[PDB]
Amino acid sequence: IPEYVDWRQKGAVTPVKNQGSCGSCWAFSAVVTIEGIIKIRTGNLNEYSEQELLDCDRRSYGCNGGYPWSALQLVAQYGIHYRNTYPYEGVQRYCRSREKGPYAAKTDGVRQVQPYNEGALLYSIANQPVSVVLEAAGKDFQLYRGGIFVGPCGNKVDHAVAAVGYGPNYILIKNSWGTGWGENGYIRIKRGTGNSYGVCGLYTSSFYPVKN
């Protein structure tokens, strides 16, 4: 795998989004991986519905948090609608996937990256955007403005995001806190420290969709 990966340069990453006050990051994270794998497999970049996963993933807890894996499993089981068809409302409502017509995309399955292994995650990122989790509760992370972020941060993960690239000393992360946070909505998080957890627990729980 190469020294640098940046799926934005490959046209596989949609504009940065803002989840608002709702604890829906798990759905945003899942959607970035779906947008990426559909572009990789089909050549088209489309935006998908975070709101649909928020409403319809019965394993997750709406705006009270949830599971990227469960959201990805829903897309493999059933499918997902375009964002335009099922736009983001920032509040969990009744699942409306039966009343929105046929699904726009469908995946084949969901695979977990071997946890607590930076190279395994880099290998995954070299193939496609990956859903990852990190500790975002620290003000150091909350106030991040740019550069390669080293912390301070612990490994009490609480926030799902998406890894869309990497370089020799960082992993490139698409956050869901709007374009005014970080580097136009992104953070570069230091890698190569030899911590198994990853900086801010970044290697704790990583999933990606499979699409034949």
Ligand SMILES: *[C@@H](C(=O)O)[C@H](O)C(=O)N[C@@H](CC(C)C)C(=O)NCCCCNC(N)=[NH2+]
């Ligand atoms: C993300 C956010 O917008 O803050 C959101 O809180 C979330 O997805 N949290 C996850 C933490 C990481 C993705 C690991 C989470 O805590 N999920 C667990 C489900 C919520 C807890 N239980 C209940 N019953 N609500």
